[PDB]
Design a protein around this motif. Sequence first.
Motif, mmCIF file in Angstrom:
data_model
loop_
_atom_site.group_PDB
_atom_site.id
_atom_site.type_symbol
_atom_site.label_atom_id
_atom_site.label_comp_id
_atom_site.label_asym_id
_atom_site.label_seq_id
_atom_site.Cartn_x
_atom_site.Cartn_y
_atom_site.Cartn_z
ATOM 1 N N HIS A 77 -19.346 -24.575 71.197
ATOM 2 C CA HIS A 77 -18.829 -23.256 71.594
ATOM 3 C C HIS A 77 -19.013 -22.887 73.055
ATOM 4 O O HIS A 77 -18.287 -21.988 73.481
ATOM 5 N N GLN A 78 -19.894 -23.516 73.796
ATOM 6 C CA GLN A 78 -20.122 -23.088 75.187
ATOM 7 C C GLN A 78 -20.574 -24.277 76.007
ATOM 8 O O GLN A 78 -21.060 -25.245 75.479
ATOM 9 N N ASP A 79 -20.354 -24.189 77.301
ATOM 10 C CA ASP A 79 -20.851 -25.194 78.261
ATOM 11 C C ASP A 79 -21.921 -24.551 79.144
ATOM 12 O O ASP A 79 -22.097 -23.304 79.205
ATOM 13 N N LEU A 80 -22.664 -25.425 79.807
ATOM 14 C CA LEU A 80 -23.793 -24.956 80.614
ATOM 15 C C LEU A 80 -23.298 -24.191 81.828
ATOM 16 O O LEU A 80 -24.042 -23.303 82.280
ATOM 17 N N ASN A 125 -19.648 -30.429 81.593
ATOM 18 C CA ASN A 125 -19.625 -31.391 80.471
ATOM 19 C C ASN A 125 -20.987 -31.470 79.768
ATOM 20 O O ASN A 125 -21.227 -32.439 79.031
ATOM 21 N N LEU A 126 -21.794 -30.423 79.893
ATOM 22 C CA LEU A 126 -23.010 -30.264 79.101
ATOM 23 C C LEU A 126 -22.744 -29.104 78.159
ATOM 24 O O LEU A 126 -22.528 -27.985 78.629
ATOM 25 N N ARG A 287 -23.494 -15.474 73.744
ATOM 26 C CA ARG A 287 -22.451 -14.464 73.483
ATOM 27 C C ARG A 287 -21.155 -15.248 73.365
ATOM 28 O O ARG A 287 -20.702 -15.813 74.391
ATOM 29 N N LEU A 288 -20.606 -15.340 72.162
ATOM 30 C CA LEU A 288 -19.374 -16.145 71.952
ATOM 31 C C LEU A 288 -18.177 -15.229 71.679
ATOM 32 O O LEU A 288 -18.290 -14.094 71.196
#
Length: 288
Positions: A77-80, A125-126, A287-288
Amino acid sequence: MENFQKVEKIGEGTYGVVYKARNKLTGEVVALKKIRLPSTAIREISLLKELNHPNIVKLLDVIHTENKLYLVFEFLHQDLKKFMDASALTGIPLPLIKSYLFQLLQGLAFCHSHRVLHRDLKPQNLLINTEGAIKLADFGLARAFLRTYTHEVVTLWYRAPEILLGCKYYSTAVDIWSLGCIFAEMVTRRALFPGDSEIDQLFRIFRTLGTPDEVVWPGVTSMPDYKPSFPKWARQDFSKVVPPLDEDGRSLLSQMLHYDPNKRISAKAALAHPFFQDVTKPVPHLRL
Ligand SMILES: O=C(O)Cc1ccc(OC2=CC=NC(=O)C2)cc1
């Protein structure tokens, strides 16, 4: 699409457009990567279907149909990059930085032990989830596809100096360098070396770490793009570069950012560094 439904375009990736998609047969949500266009790459990437670890984004399938190539990965759902932007007022808490670094080193140690490099690690890409995991996306793809798959502006900020100096071979050390840059950025809330061209990138590194020489990097002056006319900058203390990181963290970072790739700490040795004595696995606020 014959075998999926598009839920949205996620965006442009290093190799082509990336979609969030639902498998029509199973209903699962996956990341579908269209490779912007080769027989060599299919077998070699298909071997990455076997490179499975909790800190590596799972490659579910390699789909070659209608003379198009699409990689299917487990969706996160999220990247760094977005998490650091969302966390910019406070910073990512230090226990979570340490958890993230530890897990990323586990992933690199696994891939490196299986003779697979990334070559292009960067915060985008993390990938992170709600349970406190972080995973490396796209390991092995650079060797398999390398190298023109996009006209979008490539980030140089995490590129190791040997590659900026035109060495045409790679080692495990390129991934340690990139992860050191990402460590520093988590701590300081600023990119360490935000170059906008290869020479700006290389001179930003030299202004912080000092211009390399044959003493600290035997062989540097014979590397393909090395020029004797490079300016000679003195090297700054890490105490100035990444405050308020403690001496354990600064020691580890210095070992990840040695100029000579051969002197750079391995992922396996970094996991044993005193910096990780008190490592834990906190819950991130996503927070998505
Ligand atoms: O390739 C790059 O340079 C950046 C990039 C990295 C990974 C991307 O795919 C995903 C993003 C978020 N969740 C996923 O599950 C997949 C897209 C773009």
